[PDB]
Amino acid sequence: FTMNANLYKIWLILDPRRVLVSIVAFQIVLGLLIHMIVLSTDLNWLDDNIPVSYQALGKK
Amino acid sequence: FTMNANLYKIWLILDPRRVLVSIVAFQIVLGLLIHMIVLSTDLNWLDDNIPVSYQALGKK
Amino acid sequence: FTMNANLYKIWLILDPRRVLVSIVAFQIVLGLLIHMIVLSTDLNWLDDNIPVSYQALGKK
Amino acid sequence: AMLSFEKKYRVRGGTLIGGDLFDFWVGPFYVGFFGVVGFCFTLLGVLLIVWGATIGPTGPTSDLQTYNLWRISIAPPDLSYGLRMAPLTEGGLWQIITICAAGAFISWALREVEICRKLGIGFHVPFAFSFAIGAYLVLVFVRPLLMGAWGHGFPYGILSHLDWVSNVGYQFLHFHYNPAHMLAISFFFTNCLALSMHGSLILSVTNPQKGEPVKTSEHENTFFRDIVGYSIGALAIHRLGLFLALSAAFWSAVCILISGPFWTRGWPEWWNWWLELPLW
Amino acid sequence: TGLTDDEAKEFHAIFMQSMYAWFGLVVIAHLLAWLYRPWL
Amino acid sequence: SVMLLGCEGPPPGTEQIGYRGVGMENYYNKRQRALSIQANQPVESLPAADSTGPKASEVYQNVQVLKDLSVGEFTRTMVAVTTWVSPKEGCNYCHVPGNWASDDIYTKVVSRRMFELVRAANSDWKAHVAETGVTCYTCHRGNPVPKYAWVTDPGPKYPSGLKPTGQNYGSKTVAYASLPFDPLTPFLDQANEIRITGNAALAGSNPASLKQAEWTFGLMMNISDSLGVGCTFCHNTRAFNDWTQSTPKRTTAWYAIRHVRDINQNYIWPLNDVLPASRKGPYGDPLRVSCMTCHQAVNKPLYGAQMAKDYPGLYKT
Amino acid sequence: PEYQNIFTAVQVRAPAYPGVPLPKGNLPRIGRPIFSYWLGKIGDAQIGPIYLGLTGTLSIFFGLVAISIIGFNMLASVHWDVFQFLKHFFWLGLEPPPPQYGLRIPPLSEGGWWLMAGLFLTLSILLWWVRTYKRAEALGMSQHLSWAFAAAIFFYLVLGFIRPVMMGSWAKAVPFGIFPHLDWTAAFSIRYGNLYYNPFHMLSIAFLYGSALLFAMHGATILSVSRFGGDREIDQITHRGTAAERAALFWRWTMGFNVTMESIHRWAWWCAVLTVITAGIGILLSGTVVDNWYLWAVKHGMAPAYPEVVTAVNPYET
Amino acid sequence: SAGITHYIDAAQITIWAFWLFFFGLIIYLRREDKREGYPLDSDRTERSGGRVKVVGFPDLPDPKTFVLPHNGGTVVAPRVEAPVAVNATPFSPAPGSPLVPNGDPMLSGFGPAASPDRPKHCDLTFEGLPKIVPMRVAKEFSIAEGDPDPRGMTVVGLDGEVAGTVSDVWVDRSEPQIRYLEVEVAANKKKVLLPIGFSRFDKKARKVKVDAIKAAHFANVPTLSNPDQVTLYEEDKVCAYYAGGKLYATAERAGPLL
């Protein structure tokens, strides 16, 4: 089932400002979180040593 | 459908707004939680370095 | 059904909104609680390697 | 001598004990029957602390004897004496001095009581004082008693009592983990926060920027509500602060009461009840 | 809830549909999960 | 609740350690003191053995340690080593059946090394072991595997993205405190620096890190817990580093730390190749020794019961 | 018997008060009020409205970032097992860069998260500072809070930022964890030769005891004169009443001198600000100037001697 | 010589710095302490005819002016306050002796019944409307859901006799709360204030106890020069009377006990 013949009516019940701001916050949060989680697992995309060596030779 | 007919009347006893926002609150929690549980076990999909050994296709 | 006799008058003594909210809360708590108890004892169903090895499905 | 508005209140009576016998003033201090008793307990106490400084732990000629303010110390008797009176020169002195200190504090409290009765004000101060008196008693009476000997009390010396606190605390390995200790510390800290906030508020309103008039109750509430969305309000902050400080003393008294008598193992180990629940 | 007898029939209906729809998406995600990687 | 919680009743047993008023004291549970005493009971000796007879090395085929023992005494020593290390299994545990002289089963190459471990202990470490000495029982307790043997631990899991805290976890290793959870490998296996206190008031001549202080603290918590005592047992907490203000137990503990460095390094690690996976931790390191292993929560193993003096075969030469 | 003014026994409501008006520039106020019958049992029942400007929002922002790095790191340390996280939470923590790194910005997995949480936390704290000064100006008031907060910030900065940098090592700053930060405190004292003989920490301890003494006394006093509207300290300060008179006199007859309704708040203020100010000084000198306080105290002849009844020979000397 | 240990290290000199700032601080706080009640009252001043004003150490700080909002005034401290007779006589002519109140102790306005003369004007809201006013003047105010309405409870003195009944409730327009109880006195149907601090509730009974004064004393409660507001002066005058009963309302609060 997609959508009510009347699922506009949710905004007669829920404040558009609060729902909107909530969405903004939750989404930004989720983005940051998942980015962190990924940054802590294999899918790290930074400390890979590719595509060209940036620490020449050794120490750093 | 297995349920009552006088089952709408429940929204005369319980404030609908609260029930609504609350469900999303609880669900977001359960979602994050369970995800973390799985992420902590054998079903993890991140901590393995596959299909390109990201942390050892340039490092190692 | 009832307990017997007249277990409707019980709602002349206990607020229905509160008894309801209280039960939902409690059941959610009790559920999380046991789920947490069983995973913490031998009856765990996640970190068992059952039915086939997963992290070492990332091993070979 | 009196404040410029004091004579109008210097009424007669209000004692608990003594009546007109000691019902008079001396300079600015009120005497009263408990002040006379207090002065006796105090004077003999101090004068004895003076004799202890005079004799030293091994005699007046010894190198350990001293009048250096940081090092003079009168310590309790060994545990071998249990709850008996121990010889004067073997921790007895400390026992007597203790009796005098406890009696002086209880007298002091009762004198504040006669003073509340005189002025017609609440008895919040001496009640609150009684929490410090309680704390002092666990540290010299209750605890050493539950522990079968008065020697478990702390010594009366500026740094030696610090040493006492130190080794008794370390007998439990990591005292910071004492949960009552954690509480008490939180109250001492919170007390310190409310005090700093109240102080700041009053001084920030009764003395505003030049060019502004004495501020108002409305200002007071509007400010802490502006910053942190709440203002407990004038009255209540005086109520809270009293809660914080008295509670801080309370939890200190209980945090030390449980260190021995009700718990002998190290303290972090206590937290085991939490790592072992059947949830994990 | 200062609601009338009819604005909880409407609400209940819409709530029920949205909720079962939710449970539906749920069974979808769980089946994809069982397909790629069976857990029982 | 928020249960409440974990508590003992009054009055505790108490002992005065230092000078009166200094606060150096110890508290303990009488109940648990009696139960601990009953669980740390010693095995009675076997009657002394006569003889006056030839030396063990004259009547047996593979005797490389217990040489100068009389036959009788050797036999006695074998009966004790049997009940002491593996009584449910008996003689056959460390021997190839029918062949007392064979070393064709590992538990014997190990038993041999442990005969040299106990002998060394009783004769060379008295500044530590005094006249109580040690015996097989000390660690084995009717068990083939000392119940309180240890292994270097890896801690809980960390994703690949981050490295372990090295400290910060619920660990009954470090008394439940949060310090570092394996203060043993660097102090009771290796010989890293424990000292962090400066000997000068002003600074510029002590490089000790705060981190080093926490490691010393963790290790110390371990030690305290293994012997089942508090710092006032060895120290005067106003000056942990001040040796004159410490108790002669600090001296003893000093020599003990070295002793465990010798047991773990030249007697246990070498046996790692002939021992099974069942006796090894996740890094391949083997179950080794610590203070707990022997003390098992008491200042003197088995409340200072003197077992070794009855078996002359546990002493050098 | 007589009411003690502990619990408002009967409360009263009026439409919430959005407060005194701020001039142009101080943005609107947000959120709309509520009353908690129970807070009301002990205090103003009004909950909010709150003000949130650029400052305040940018501070809420930094602060929550910092709280996230600390938390996420703690979940990571028990392997994302939130059960385990819940189990060891008290013991969980985010340790600082290791010494091998000095004051360099370290890799994510070795402390870099701590430096980011430390960075963002401090910025968010000092932004909350500015916030409280702005919020304090719009009302024409003075900066007494801000001078105290500045004192407490001082101690904070001394703990995790000033001393580490001076000592050339982020590992010397304090780690984020309840029990871990307890351990940092204890280890801290041990490393520097018993912090008890450090005079500054004794004064700070005298000032903490003192914040408890003063708030206990003053609070008890004000409640005892709460029958005369003594809590209304503002008007007792401008138009001295028998509340401020009975108040000053109770103390006068007990200990021989006294202060005034306005001045007691100056004694209190200064005594709180003093804890944090001696405290920070105390940490400032640890390792930078003095390395072993017990020794320092011996050098200044303040450390007591007791008959040496128990002793141990030093194996390092055999 | 690369080792000449200096005996003075930064910690010494910093503890010195502390103590100096400390002393200046203590002194300063003790100066703010004399912005009221000073110079003191001795028979040193009166014996000398006044050439010995009592102030002690440190000395008194220059006056400071508080500029009250709303056409209120200007207050100074320290100020010069006109002496005020004592409504009592020396229990002894000897110094340090207390005085016995003149007349009917509760009327005396001496001792627990004493009080100063605060302004004969009203404290004001931010707006400038009488801060403390009755709920009858403060239309908006309202009891909190679930709290017995004081309005209509019976006020009863210390010996159990009814005094009157609560005819209204005075409230703070600045910090919403019950400040005063109004009492329609039984014995003369005149209206008096009763401070909340002196009133105890007995909710199941809808009573309002007062250990402070006796039922009869409610007859002499100081009165308001206007029934829809109250002045600072009047607040003190009202509370102090009740306070008097704490030592006067019975021939026994006088103490001793033994």
Ligand code: BCL
């Ligand atoms: C040493 C190792 C342990 C340690 C071991 C102990 C031990 C052991 C104790 C404490 C105690 C306490 N510790 Mg600790 N403590 C540690 C670390 C800390 C830390 C920290 C930052 O880490 C803090 C904040 C504290 C703080 C606290 C307080 C919670 C508490 C003392 C309150 C008190 O005495 O009230 C009570 C107040 C009084 C008793 C004074 C009573 C006043 C009397 C009636 C009047 C005296 C009048 C006198 C005559 C005045 C003289 C005036 C002249 C006459 C003019 N500890 C370390 C980790 N801590 C003590 C406690 O638990 O509470 C008792 C205690 O016994």
Ligand code: BCL
């Ligand atoms: C465990 C192994 C598999 C896995 C298997 C599954 C399975 C199996 C499931 C999910 C499901 C979820 N997974 Mg997954 N998932 C994995 C990997 C990921 C990754 C990742 C970074 O790799 C991510 C981001 C996700 C993300 C998610 C969420 C999108 C989703 C649950 C929705 C929810 O909780 O909301 C709760 C819902 C709500 C809060 C409300 C829903 C909308 C309401 C009804 C709209 C009404 C309007 C509302 C009132 C106003 C909106 C405002 C609110 C602020 C929203 N998965 C791993 C690889 N995943 C679930 C799913 O798909 O949904 C069926 C699911 O059953």
Ligand code: BCL
């Ligand atoms: C709580 C656990 C320990 C304890 C923990 C500490 C710690 C920790 C410290 C002190 C410190 C001190 N403690 Mg202590 N202290 C305890 C119980 C006591 C008792 C008691 C009889 O109960 C007394 C009188 C004292 C008194 C003192 C002073 C020696 C000193 C500073 C007090 C201060 O500023 O506090 C706030 C109170 C005031 C400001 C009121 C001012 C009154 C003055 C300061 C107290 C005068 C004491 C006087 C010099 C000697 C006592 C009177 C003699 C009988 C004549 N402590 C318990 C036993 N105490 C501090 C110090 O520097 O000592 C090295 C310190 O660091």
Ligand code: BCL
């Ligand atoms: C444990 C071994 C030592 C010990 C070692 C130390 C050390 C080390 C220290 C103290 C410190 C203190 N000790 Mg001590 N202390 C011991 C025994 C005691 C005893 C006792 C009865 O024996 C007492 C009373 C004390 C008392 C005290 C306090 C007086 C003093 C600082 C108080 C304070 O609040 O600062 C705390 C206040 C702050 C840090 C400011 C807070 C402001 C910040 C900005 C708030 C931010 C909030 C945040 C942004 C909100 C978001 C939360 C995020 C999760 C972070 N200690 C023993 C002897 N003690 C300090 C000291 O004296 O140094 C010289 C210190 O650092």
Ligand SMILES: CC[C@H]1c2cc3[nH]c4c(c3C)C(=O)[C@H](C(=O)OC)c4c3nc(cc4[nH]c(cc(n2)[C@@H]1C)c(C(C)=O)c4C)[C@@H](C)[C@@H]3CCC(=O)OC/C=C(\C)CCC[C@H](C)CCC[C@H](C)CCCC(C)C
């Ligand atoms: C319980 C909450 C807080 C509190 C409350 C409190 N204290 C109070 C009061 C209150 C409400 C008073 O009204 C009362 C007071 O008068 O105000 C200053 C008091 C008091 N707070 C004081 C001290 C005090 N309170 C403290 C703490 C606390 N008190 C808590 C933080 C502390 C500490 C250790 O932090 C101290 C030091 C006193 C100034 C005063 C009570 C003084 C008094 O009663 O005087 C009579 C006694 C004498 C004059 C001395 C008697 C002589 C003795 C025979 C010798 C003393 C021997 C002593 C045991 C040796 C200790 C040696 C030290 C070097 C260790």
Ligand SMILES: CC[C@H]1c2cc3[nH]c4c(c3C)C(=O)[C@H](C(=O)OC)c4c3nc(cc4[nH]c(cc(n2)[C@@H]1C)c(C(C)=O)c4C)[C@@H](C)[C@@H]3CCC(=O)OC/C=C(\C)CCC[C@H](C)CCC[C@H](C)CCCC(C)C
């Ligand atoms: C004399 C010094 C004493 C003192 C004084 C003091 N403390 C102070 C101040 C002062 C003068 C302030 O001005 C300030 C204050 O605000 O007081 C209420 C403060 C302060 N003291 C505090 C803590 C504190 N102070 C302490 C100590 C001390 N402070 C000393 C006792 C202590 C200790 C050691 O115990 C602590 C724990 C804070 C309440 C406050 C500083 C708060 C701060 O800096 O904020 C930084 C940022 C954050 C905390 C982030 C905000 C997190 C929010 C709770 C989340 C809200 C989320 C929201 C719903 C939005 C949604 C999120 C979106 C991203 C989606």
Ligand SMILES: CC(C)=CCC/C(C)=C/CC/C(C)=C\CC/C(C)=C\CC/C(C)=C/CC/C(C)=C/CC/C(C)=C/CC/C(C)=C/CC1=C(C)C(=O)c2ccccc2C1=O
């Ligand atoms: C042998 C023989 C015959 C003896 C001879 C007699 C001798 C020796 C005489 C010497 C005389 C002198 C010099 C000494 C007397 C010493 C006495 C007896 C002891 C002092 C007792 C005493 C308690 C002193 C403690 C001092 C300290 C610093 C206490 C801490 C409390 C504190 C910080 C004090 C200052 C701040 C005070 C007083 C605040 C009180 C106060 C508070 C708290 C308000 O809230 C309030 C609200 C509204 C108006 C006023 C006030 C107010 O005044």
Ligand SMILES: COC1=C(OC)C(=O)C(C/C=C(\C)CC/C=C(\C)CC/C=C(\C)CC/C=C(\C)CC/C=C(\C)CC/C=C(\C)CC/C=C(\C)CCC=C(C)C)=C(C)C1=O
């Ligand atoms: C001028 O007036 C002022 C105002 O008025 C306008 C203000 O609004 C304000 C603003 C004030 C605020 C916003 C207040 C801020 C307060 C803060 C930040 C404190 C933090 C406190 C908490 C987070 C709550 C902690 C407490 C609890 C959770 C309760 C826990 C209960 C427990 C542990 C069990 C209780 C039992 C005990 C403690 C045992 C025994 C205790 C006693 C005997 C104590 C006795 C107490 C009394 C009061 C008589 C100020 C500063 C002001 O000065």
Ligand SMILES: COC(C)(C)C/C=C/C(C)=C/C=C/C(C)=C/C=C/C(C)=C/C=C\C=C(C)\C=C\C=C(C)\C=C\C=C(C)\C=C\CC(C)(C)OC
């Ligand atoms: C699963 O969890 C989710 C919700 C994500 C989030 C949960 C978060 C939680 C629960 C977090 C819990 C956090 C706790 C309990 C934290 C407790 C912390 C404690 C007790 C800390 C105690 C003391 C810490 C101190 C004093 C820290 C001091 C650090 C300082 C001063 C750092 C300063 C650093 C600076 C200024 C950085 C400079 C960077 C520069 C610019 C120099 O870089 C070049």
Ligand code: HEM
């Ligand atoms: C009652 C049971 C036992 C008997 C009768 C017994 C008997 C003997 C005999 C007769 C020998 C000499 C055999 C030879 O070298 O040719 C011997 C050697 C040895 N047995 Fe035992 N044994 C017993 C139990 C044990 C146990 C339990 C252990 C180990 C825990 C053990 C460890 C050894 C070792 C290591 C040797 C070689 C000794 C050395 O180099 O000094 N035996 N045993």
Ligand code: HEM
């Ligand atoms: C949990 C509380 C304890 C703490 C905090 C602690 C702390 C310390 C510290 C910091 C040192 C280093 C002093 C220096 O740097 O010179 C130390 C050394 C030492 N402690 Fe402990 N200790 C505790 C319990 C114990 C116990 C029970 C014993 C004895 C069984 C003990 C025996 C020793 C010995 C022998 C040394 C000297 C080590 C060496 O020089 O290599 N400690 N302790």
Ligand SMILES: [Ba+2]
């Ligand atoms: Ba690079």
Ligand SMILES: [Ba+2]
């Ligand atoms: Ba990668």
Ligand SMILES: [Ba+2]
């Ligand atoms: Ba996998």
Ligand SMILES: [Ba+2]
């Ligand atoms: Ba378990």
Ligand SMILES: [Ba+2]
């Ligand atoms: Ba013990």
